[PDB]
């Protein structure tokens, strides 16, 4: 066999590509970023009807001003979120202010490539890349509402909207069309909800799709089933026309 930090003849880190694959099998997560907030919606994806849908945590709060949606081997995200939280709280402690979302995100990605078996570069103590990707969305005063996609490669990009997980290419394509500067929080909720509907195998309802948003006024809010259901209903009608 060969090491875990070996480069392919095409100039890529195997384990990184491979984890990126595992990420392709995850529940969809979509985030859209508007001048009124950022929406992050995800597909619960219960593997049995006896599983209590509400016990599916795929959208987490990092801080009052930063939320996050995951996609992939969701158990791998626990230590990432923790680090994200501690990183933000700690920042508030040392500087009496909120951490910039980029900064928070950047801190999370610093973990990414810290895997290996004695890689003479520092002390990399993790046996394999994270098998999950995150959608980090939040708001700070300097650069407004922001959405970030964080991959196990250490790179992260800022998107006006992005989809990760199984239905990514399709959803991404749809987003690409529907998105525009002057969108509104509700419109966004809808698109996420709509596009989720599309790529979702089972029929989207309040117990399998989860929406959340983050706004300057109220912060990271995970939408309660009842609020989301109303939107789902508001959608069947918007779609059931033309």
């Amino acid at each position: 066999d060969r090491g875990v930090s070996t480069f392919s003849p095409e100039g890529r880190l195997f384990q990184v590509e491979y984890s990126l694959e595992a990420i392709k099998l995850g529940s969809t997560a979509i985030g859209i970023a508007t001048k009124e907030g950022v929406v992050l919606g995800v597909e619960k994806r219960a593997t049995s009807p006896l599983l209590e849908s509400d016990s599916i945590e795929k959208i987490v709060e990092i801080d009052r001003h930063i939320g996050c949606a995951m996609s992939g081997l969701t158990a791998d995200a626990r230590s990432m979120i923790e680090h994200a939280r501690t990183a933000a709280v700690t920042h508030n402690l040392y500087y009496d202010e909120d951490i910039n979302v980029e900064s928070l995100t950047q801190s999370v990605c610093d973990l990414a490539l810290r895997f290996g078996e004695g890689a003479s570069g520092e002390e990399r103590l993790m046996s394999r890349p994270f098998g999950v990707a995150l959608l980090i969305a939040g708001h700070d005063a300097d650069d407004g509402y922001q959405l970030f996609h964080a991959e196990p490669s250490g790179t992260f990009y800022r998107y006006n909207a992005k989809a990760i997980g199984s239905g990514s290419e399709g959803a991404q394509a749809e987003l690409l069309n529907e998105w525009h500067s002057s969108l509104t929080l509700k419109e966004a909720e809808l698109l996420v909800l709509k596009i989720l509907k599309q790529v979702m195998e089972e029929k989207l309802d309040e117990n399998n799709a989860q929406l959340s948003c983050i706004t300057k006024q109220d912060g990271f809010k995970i939408y309660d089933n009842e609020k989301t259901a109303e939107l789902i209903k508001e959608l069947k009608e918007k779609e059931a026309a033309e």
Binding site: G121, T155, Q172
Partner: protein, 233 residues
């Protein structure tokens, strides 16, 4: 063949090649393009930033290391961070412990030595990014090119990334001209932009697309992005 000797950086091929290092060099050729060129008074960096979708940002490719040094990256960004961060620390140490601005030549020497450790050590991995370094110091303007192999070279100018060869040849001719652009910042930049355009194919360099950085005599390493590069297209 290859498949037997490319398993790690601690193995030499029967030709005397280090494949992991070579494979590392490839991620650079995969990256976007960036160009560096210096006169006798300024050093500029122009780099084409690369988005992922028409719905995303254009990956930042230039990093300020000190008030007198900075670099544009080509390849694996993380490795760029790790390396620039190291360049930031060594610059800091010189200021703090000696009250001396770090010599680009020395900064170069230090980068080479850092990469080399990941090209002779087990379980480690070469860095996967090339770097264009510019800076002004006690001996004028400088531009340095860094490769994961550990090789660093000082040039009047150069370019790296996909299609780099365009600009690299362009400058190779444009030399006698730009090296004489003394006391005129905007021109060198222009020269840079022209050069960068020699390695294009996609679409013309735009606002979200371009990234330029300049350092010089009475000019601290400053990063110009978008709204401010408009006048340089």
């Amino acid at each position: 063949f290859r498949n037997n000797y490319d398993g790690d950086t601690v193995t030499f091929s029967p030709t005397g090649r280090l494949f992991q290092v070579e494979y590392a060099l490839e991620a650079i050729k995969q990256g976007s393009v960036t160009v560096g060129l210096r006169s006798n008074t300024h050093a500029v960096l122009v780099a084409l930033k690369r988005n992922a979708d028409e719905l995303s940002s254009y990956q930042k490719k230039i990093i300020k290391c000190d008030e007198h040094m900075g670099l544009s990256l080509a390849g694996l960004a993380p490795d760029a961070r790790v390396l620039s961060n190291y360049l930031r620390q060594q610059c800091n140490y010189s200021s703090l412990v000696f009250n001396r601005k770090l010599a680009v030549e020395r900064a170069g020497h230090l980068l080479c030595d850092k990469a080399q450790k990941n090209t002779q050590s087990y379980g480690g991995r070469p860095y996967g990014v090339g770097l264009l370094i510019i800076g002004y110091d006690k001996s004028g303007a400088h531009l340095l090119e860094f490769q994961p192999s550990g090789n660093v070279t000082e040039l009047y100018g150069t370019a790296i990334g996909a299609r780099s060869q365009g600009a690299k040849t362009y400058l190779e001719r444009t030399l006698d001209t730009f090296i004489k652009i003394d006391g005129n910042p905007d021109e060198l930049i222009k020269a840079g932009v022209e050069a960068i355009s020699q390695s294009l194919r996609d679409e013309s360099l735009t606002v979200d697309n371009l990234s330029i950085a300049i350092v010089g005599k009475d000019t601290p390493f400053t990063i110009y992005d978008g709204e401010a590069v408009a006048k340089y297209i």
